[PDB]
Amino acid sequence: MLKYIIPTIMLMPLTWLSKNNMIWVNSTAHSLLISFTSLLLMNQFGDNSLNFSLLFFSDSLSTPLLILTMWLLPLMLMASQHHLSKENLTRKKLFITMLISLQLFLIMTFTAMELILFYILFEATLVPTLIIITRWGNQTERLNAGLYFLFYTLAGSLPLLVALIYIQNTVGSLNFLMLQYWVQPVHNSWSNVFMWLACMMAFMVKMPLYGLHLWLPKAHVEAPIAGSMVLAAVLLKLGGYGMLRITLILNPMTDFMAYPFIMLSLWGMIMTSSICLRQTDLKSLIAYSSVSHMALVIVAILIQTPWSYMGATALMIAHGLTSSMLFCLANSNYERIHSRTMILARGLQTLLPLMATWWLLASLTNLALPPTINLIGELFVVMSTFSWSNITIILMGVNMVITALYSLYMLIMTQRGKYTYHINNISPSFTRENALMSLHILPLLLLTLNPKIILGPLY
Amino acid sequence: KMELPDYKQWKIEGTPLETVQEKLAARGLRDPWGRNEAWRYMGGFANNVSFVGALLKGFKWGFAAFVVAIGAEYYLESQ
Amino acid sequence: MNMFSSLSLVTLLLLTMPIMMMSFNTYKPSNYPLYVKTAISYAFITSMIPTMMFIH
Amino acid sequence: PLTLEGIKDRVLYVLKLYDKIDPEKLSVNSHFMKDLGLDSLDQVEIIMAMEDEFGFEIPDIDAEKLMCPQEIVDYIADKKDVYE
Amino acid sequence: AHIEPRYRQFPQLTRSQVIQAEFFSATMWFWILWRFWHDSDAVLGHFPYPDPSQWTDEELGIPPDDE
Amino acid sequence: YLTHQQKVLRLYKRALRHLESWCIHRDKYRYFACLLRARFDEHKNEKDMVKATQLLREAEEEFWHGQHPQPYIFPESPGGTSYERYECYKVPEWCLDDWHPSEKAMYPDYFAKREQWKKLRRESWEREVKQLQEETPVGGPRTEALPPARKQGDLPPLWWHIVTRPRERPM
Amino acid sequence: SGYTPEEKLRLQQLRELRRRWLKDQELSPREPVLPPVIYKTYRHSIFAFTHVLIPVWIIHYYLKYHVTTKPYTIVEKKPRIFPGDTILETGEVIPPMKEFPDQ
Amino acid sequence: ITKDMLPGPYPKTPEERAAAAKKYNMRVEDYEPYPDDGTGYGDYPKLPDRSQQERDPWYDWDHPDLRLNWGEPMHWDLDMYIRNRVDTSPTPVNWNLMCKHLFGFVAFMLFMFWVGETYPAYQPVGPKQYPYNNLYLERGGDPNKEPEPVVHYEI
Amino acid sequence: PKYEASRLSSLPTTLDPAEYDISSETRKAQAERLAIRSRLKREYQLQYYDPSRRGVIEDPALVRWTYARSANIYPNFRPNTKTSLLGALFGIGPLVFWYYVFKTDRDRKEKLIQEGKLDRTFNISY
Amino acid sequence: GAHLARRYLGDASVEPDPLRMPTFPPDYGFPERKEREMVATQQEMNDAQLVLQQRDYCAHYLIRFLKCKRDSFPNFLACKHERHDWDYCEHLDYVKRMKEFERERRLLQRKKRREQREADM
Numbered sequence A: 001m002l003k004y005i006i007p008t009i010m011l012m013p014l015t016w017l018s019k020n021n022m023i024w025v026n027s028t029a030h031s032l033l034i035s036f037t038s039l040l041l042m043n044q045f046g047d048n049s050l051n052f053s054l055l056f057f058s059d060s061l062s063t064p065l066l067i068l069t070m071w072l073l074p075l076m077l078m079a080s081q082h083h084l085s086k087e088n089l090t091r092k093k094l095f096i097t098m099l100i101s102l103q104l105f106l107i108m109t110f111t112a113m114e115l116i117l118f119y120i121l122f123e124a125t126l127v128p129t130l131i132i133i134t135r136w137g138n139q140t141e142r143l144n145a146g147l148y149f150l151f152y153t154l155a156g157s158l159p160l161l162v163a164l165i166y167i168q169n170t171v172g173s174l175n176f177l178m179l180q181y182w183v184q185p186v187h188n189s190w191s192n193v194f195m196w197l198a199c200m201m202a203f204m205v206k207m208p209l210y211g212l213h214l215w216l217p218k219a220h221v222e223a224p225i226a227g228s229m230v231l232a233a234v235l236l237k238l239g240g241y242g243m244l245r246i247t248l249i250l251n252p253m254t255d256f257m258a259y260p261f262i263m264l265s266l267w268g269m270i271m272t273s274s275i276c277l278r279q280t281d282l283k284s285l286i287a288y289s290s291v292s293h294m295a296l297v298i299v300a301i302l303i304q305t306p307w308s309y310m311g312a313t314a315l316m317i318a319h320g321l322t323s324s325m326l327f328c329l330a331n332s333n334y335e336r337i338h339s340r341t342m343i344l345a346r347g348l349q350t351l352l353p354l355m356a357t358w359w360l361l362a363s364l365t366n367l368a369l370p371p372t373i374n375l376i377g378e379l380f381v382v383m384s385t386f387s388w389s390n391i392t393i394i395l396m397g398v399n400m401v402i403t404a405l406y407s408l409y410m411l412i413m414t415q416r417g418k419y420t421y422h423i424n425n426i427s428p429s430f431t432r433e434n435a436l437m438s439l440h441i442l443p444l445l446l447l448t449l450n451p452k453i454i455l456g457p458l459y
Numbered sequence B: 001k002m003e004l005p006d007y008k009q010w011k012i013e014g015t016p017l018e019t020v021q022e023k024l025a026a027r028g029l030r031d032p033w034g035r036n037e038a039w040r041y042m043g044g045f046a047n048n049v050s051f052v053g054a055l056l057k058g059f060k061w062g063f064a065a066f067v068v069a070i071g072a073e074y075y076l077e078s079q
Numbered sequence C: 001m002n003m004f005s006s007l008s009l010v011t012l013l014l015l016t017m018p019i020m021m022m023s024f025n026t027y028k029p030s031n032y033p034l035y036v037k038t039a040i041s042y043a044f045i046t047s048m049i050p051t052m053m054f055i056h
Numbered sequence D: 001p002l003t004l005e006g007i008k009d010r011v012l013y014v015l016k017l018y019d020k021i022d023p024e025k026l027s028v029n030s031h032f033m034k035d036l037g038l039d040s041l042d043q044v045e046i047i048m049a050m051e052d053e054f055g056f057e058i059p060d061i062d063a064e065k066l067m068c069p070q071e072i073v074d075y076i077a078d079k080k081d082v083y084e
Numbered sequence E: 001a002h003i004e005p006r007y008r009q010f011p012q013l014t015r016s017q018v019i020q021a022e023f024f025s026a027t028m029w030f031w032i033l034w035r036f037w038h039d040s041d042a043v044l045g046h047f048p049y050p051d052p053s054q055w056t057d058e059e060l061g062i063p064p065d066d067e
Numbered sequence F: 001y002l003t004h005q006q007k008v009l010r011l012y013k014r015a016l017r018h019l020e021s022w023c024i025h026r027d028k029y030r031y032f033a034c035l036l037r038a039r040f041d042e043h044k045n046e047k048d049m050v051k052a053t054q055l056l057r058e059a060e061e062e063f064w065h066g067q068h069p070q071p072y073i074f075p076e077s078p079g080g081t082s083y084e085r086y087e088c089y090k091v092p093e094w095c096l097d098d099w100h101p102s103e104k105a106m107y108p109d110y111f112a113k114r115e116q117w118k119k120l121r122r123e124s125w126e127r128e129v130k131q132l133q134e135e136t137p138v139g140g141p142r143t144e145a146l147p148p149a150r151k152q153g154d155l156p157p158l159w160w161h162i163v164t165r166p167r168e169r170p171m
Numbered sequence G: 001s002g003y004t005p006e007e008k009l010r011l012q013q014l015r016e017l018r019r020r021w022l023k024d025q026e027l028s029p030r031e032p033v034l035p036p037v038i039y040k041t042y043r044h045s046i047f048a049f050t051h052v053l054i055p056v057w058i059i060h061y062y063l064k065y066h067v068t069t070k071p072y073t074i075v076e077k078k079p080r081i082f083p084g085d086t087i088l089e090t091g092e093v094i095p096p097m098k099e100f101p102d103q
Numbered sequence H: 001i002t003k004d005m006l007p008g009p010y011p012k013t014p015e016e017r018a019a020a021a022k023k024y025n026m027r028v029e030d031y032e033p034y035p036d037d038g039t040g041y042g043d044y045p046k047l048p049d050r051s052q053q054e055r056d057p058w059y060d061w062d063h064p065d066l067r068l069n070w071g072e073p074m075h076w077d078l079d080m081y082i083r084n085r086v087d088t089s090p091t092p093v094n095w096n097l098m099c100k101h102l103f104g105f106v107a108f109m110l111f112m113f114w115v116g117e118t119y120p121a122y123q124p125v126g127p128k129q130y131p132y133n134n135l136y137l138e139r140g141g142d143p144n145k146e147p148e149p150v151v152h153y154e155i
Numbered sequence I: 001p002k003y004e005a006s007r008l009s010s011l012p013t014t015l016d017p018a019e020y021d022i023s024s025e026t027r028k029a030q031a032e033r034l035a036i037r038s039r040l041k042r043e044y045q046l047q048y049y050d051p052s053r054r055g056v057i058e059d060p061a062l063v064r065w066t067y068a069r070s071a072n073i074y075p076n077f078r079p080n081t082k083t084s085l086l087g088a089l090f091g092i093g094p095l096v097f098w099y100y101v102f103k104t105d106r107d108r109k110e111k112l113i114q115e116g117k118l119d120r121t122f123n124i125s126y
Numbered sequence J: 001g002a003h004l005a006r007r008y009l010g011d012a013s014v015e016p017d018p019l020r021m022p023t024f025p026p027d028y029g030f031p032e033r034k035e036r037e038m039v040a041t042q043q044e045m046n047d048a049q050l051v052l053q054q055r056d057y058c059a060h061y062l063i064r065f066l067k068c069k070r071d072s073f074p075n076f077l078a079c080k081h082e083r084h085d086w087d088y089c090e091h092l093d094y095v096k097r098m099k100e101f102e103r104e105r106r107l108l109q110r111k112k113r114r115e116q117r118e119a120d121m
């Protein structure tokens, strides 16, 4: 992975040694080049994973997440450079440095072979993320959002640290390849119940599981755009990726320990989907949409079937691009009217025709129109949960109806109807904004032509 | 630019608006807007077909063609 | 079979061409509706050939 | 394609077919109450006849203010963006 | 246009629309009459419907009571 | 906010429109329109206003019982089939300020005249504000009514968004 | 219950401005100043060539040389065979049905 | 917006009620907060539970599509009462009568369909007869197990 | 036959008996309502018509509404017999309900599979 | 209809059950009852690819008609004679089913009659 770690590190001297007026041009260009080289991780085999060294390996799960991570960095620089224009040069470079350091931690997190190494990098991503929200967030409540984000994570991740160290004492290793062969079944006992909870709760809080999700709508409403993009696109998936790995060593206890969390997710997705119908803040609505989509991923991971694991992987990639798009679309309205209230600016299709097309395409992927990878992932999960229990189709089906209602409600309210009379500063869409939208949707829709590369190891 | 037809020509006499005026006079009333409706009962609008007349549009020539067609068919078969 | 299958697919591909031309390649916006209407009428002709083969 | 004179002709055409108005003492400035001696029930019927004539509704709050043919012509020209 | 609107009067009509409309109305009635002439069974009945009460006990294999 | 007279005249117009919806045929509607007008005429000169209010209340109950469940609506009236149909084509005039110079170059005459209107609006605004100040009582306006211009060369206060509103058929 | 004299004056003044604004929406003669049966068959001839002949060439080439070179990609229902038919592949003759009872 | 212009806790004294009414641009005689339970409405006004569709469509609203005026207090459930969503307009037929007639119609039909299944219509014919042991082989029958014969006779 | 109002069908204004019995005290209140509306209308129109303005006319009523519908709830929340019973009834209850629905369904299915009475003849995708 | 009124309002015991009939042996009252002949063989119907519900005792007429249709293309007004022969055969088939119903009905009425005779001693 050094071929990706080192050029990612080199982005920092590049940004600090650039001409004052070329920091965005240089950092954007070269992080796109890094993104290009990340397609070499597609050398995946039918049986064995791509095992680079003692520290890092890649397989069909981490590879799509790695490519999404490295693609998002140039998109985040594009999205941020406008609202940061007044910021002084040194603080602009510090912002870019936090984004670069976040990518470095993420690519190491997704390829770490040893689980304790994964833990440290999994935890390291908090620091830059918290700095981005609290330092460059706009409103007073970013400080509270920083605290809720920090302490929800640590409340769960500290027990995970104890469990992981305990496993290494008992098994002798935390290398994931070793655990694949030395895994022993988890017997029933109260000690093992709490070992299971310690191994899972940290990832649940990040997903987030319904009931532990209240930190996420806060974080989004306060974060700058780049913070929201990385939060929705990648940082939520640290939980899913972690769960997909650690469930290896929790069998067969997961058979019954998953029940409370399947109930929370199955009922949670309908609650959060219903909540979206009444949200008044556009960022908050998109945030609640994420909780509903990720509730599907939790269920898929917990029932552990080949179809559910393939659907979970596709959903994680598909949601990453869609939710990042939706935040970017909402932000482009914010940069004009400086309010997140959904009902403030209406009938924008009359004033911004092409931006309304991006709004339509994003909404259609959010409601999972076939054959988008959003639908492929959701469908594979629905198929597998039907076998788990036929009654789940009723809950899955109801959520599909509610998802369409709130996705189109968001499109109708902001883009259709009559424009607001007094809002007279809706200037035409910039080339930057249009390019940013298309750099989300185009790879998303292109993936429909070759979905296998985002279906994960079980493919 | 547009020539409105002379307003004086619009009279209710001979139309079913005249029947209504007679009915109203039996009660001591009068309809003052009758001439504003008169155009609907005059000119090219005076005679509309009945429902059976509407369904039979084209029946005469359809029957004429049909009769000629079967007579020809009787001839060809006869030979 | 070669004519039947080839012509049945050409009907569907014919209908997608006016959509592909929205990429401003060789477009004549003056009368896009006529262009779309002409594609439908030509697709109807091509679809009658395999339809005729099925009836036979 | 309505014109100001076209609107005026049709407004006066309708009023000349109303039995309660003498067609010779009617001008574009005749006041329905102070000149032609009509009452408010009569005025409501006139507005309804204009609505039928031009095929659109005049709300009660605006309708009650139109008290001469010219005001009706002005009201209709405004709603229909007629400037010639 | 070649058709100018009229006020409170029957509209102007072209010969094409009147002749074409009558031809297709006449075509409808010829077709019905022509089809009814040759295919009246499609409307009235193809085959006779028998009366089951007129079938003898012999042909239905009904033995006499004392059998 | 409605007087007794306004309430009666609104019911008369409303009752006739529902009557017309029931009758359909013009000769039939004319007949019953005169019968209904007679009913309003018998109580035209009622003086005891308590009785007049009771007559109005009973008439409204009668209207509610006998209203058409699907009355005729003019196409562009609220609830009509063409209501708000052309709102998607109405674009505010401030959008022309964001046109690219090459777009403006296609209509040199329109945009020269547009600048004259913007100049007129700019030079009129201060006087419009002042007129409203000096004509408004201390505690602010008590009604939504606005006044005309008083001097020559003045424009009626707050005229721009009325004069420059989108056309009813803007495309 | 008509306009007050002040209402009448305001409406008249706005009406003068509105009509002037609407007149100013008319395009001048030069606007928009823009920057720099034989035919019928040919129109339909070029369309048939580019939208039927070229696509069918591509589809036939694709079906013949890529799709039908793989198993079970195009599967036909086997032709119906009736009593009295002759087979082209073998020359086999299918025997007729029995003699029908009179009816 | 200062904090004195933002929603506050439920008002207790009459002076708080007057202050809250003014902040919300209401007459103190009209202002009425939601009942003080644990719900969390604070001092936000309770306004009539009416759809925006019921508002006068001919008045010159600052927001014609919503039928709202700038500065007027918004109903707590305004987003549920937009014209695209819940309507509370008067109906020509009483609500309770409509529910009676609709349910009565559906219940009657379901009963008759059940009746019609118990007493089906059919023609006076015997079963359709098929050759070759009721097409035993054609219907996928096992060709190694001889079927129990099905014989049909002339009539 | 009197009009019966419902939550989703309001009483028509013309059938409202309070609509006609209008006192001088009720006309005074209607005048004060129109004064507040007119005062706000003027404040809005002075900004709406200002030729030099470009942006959004911030509406405190809209800000108060979005603030009330979120940040203002918990400060004015009191744990009591109502919110606790509604909190329990619609917070824990559905999870327990669905747990038993799915748990019962899965126990029945697993018992049939082990006994070999569930038809899984062609079931090889899961 | 008529038979339905008798069964549902009248005495259901003397009316056939369309879902159970026949309830008497085929040869009961029918000395030397012949078998139904079948002209088309199983292989012929299989090769002609008739719908299973069409593989009845009239299949030979349907096969003859189907061959004519293919041979007379593009003249879709031909094969009227062959179509009528198949339609007519199906009519005779339907009449035989009417005879089975009527036979069953009269046997039930005889069964009841004998039971009145038996228990009236």
Ligand SMILES: CCCCCCCCCCCCO[C@@H]1O[C@H](CO)[C@@H](O[C@H]2O[C@H](CO)[C@@H](O)[C@H](O)[C@H]2O)[C@H](O)[C@H]1O
Pocket (backbone or CB within 6 Å): A016, A017, A018, A019, A020
């Ligand atoms: C033996 C241990 C020590 C190892 C040291 C190895 C590196 C030594 C580098 C010495 C030269 C550093 O150069 C010094 O810093 C930066 C980058 O050049 C320059 O100043 C910089 O300003 C801005 C960025 O802030 C940019 O326009 C551009 O990067 C540069 O002009 C200074 O004008 C220069 O004086």
Ligand SMILES: CCCCCCCCCCCCO[C@@H]1O[C@H](CO)[C@@H](O[C@H]2O[C@H](CO)[C@@H](O)[C@H](O)[C@H]2O)[C@H](O)[C@H]1O
Pocket (backbone or CB within 6 Å): A144, A147, A148, A151, A152, A153, A155, A156, I074, I075
């Ligand atoms: C279950 C696993 C995760 C559990 C995580 C729980 C740990 C605590 C997380 C939040 C820590 C924030 O720490 C502190 O919390 C309180 C509210 O909670 C915040 O305070 C906020 O809510 C309180 C209570 O309504 C208000 O009085 C206050 O005005 C408001 O700012 C503090 O400003 C913050 O400094």
Ligand SMILES: CCCCCCCCCCCCO[C@@H]1O[C@H](CO)[C@@H](O[C@H]2O[C@H](CO)[C@@H](O)[C@H](O)[C@H]2O)[C@H](O)[C@H]1O
Pocket (backbone or CB within 6 Å): B061, B062, B065, E018, E019, E022, E023, E026, E027, E030, E031
């Ligand atoms: C395969 C065969 C299919 C059927 C083919 C049948 C073809 C028949 C063509 C008939 C053409 C008739 O054409 C139309 O006839 C009607 C007869 O009312 C004429 O209408 C006539 O009567 C009406 C009033 O009744 C008057 O306008 C006028 O006296 C006269 O025009 C039309 O002026 C003429 O245009």
Ligand SMILES: CCCCCCCCCCCCO[C@@H]1O[C@H](CO)[C@@H](O[C@H]2O[C@H](CO)[C@@H](O)[C@H](O)[C@H]2O)[C@H](O)[C@H]1O
Pocket (backbone or CB within 6 Å): H097, H100, H101, H104, H105, H108, H109, I001
């Ligand atoms: C081929 C058609 C097949 C479908 C036919 C279905 C028809 C079945 C209709 C059943 C529903 C009738 O329901 C019944 O209607 C009557 C008449 O309004 C109601 O009767 C009541 O309402 C009316 C009107 O307010 C009042 O006179 C009084 O309050 C009371 O009589 C009953 O309260 C209701 O229970």
Ligand SMILES: *C(=O)CCCCCCCCCCCCC
Pocket (backbone or CB within 6 Å): H112, H115, H116, H119, H121, H122, H123, H124, J001, J002, J004
């Ligand atoms: C005789 O050949 C049958 C004709 C069908 C008659 C159907 C009668 C329908 C009457 C209502 C059905 C009520 C439910 C039993």
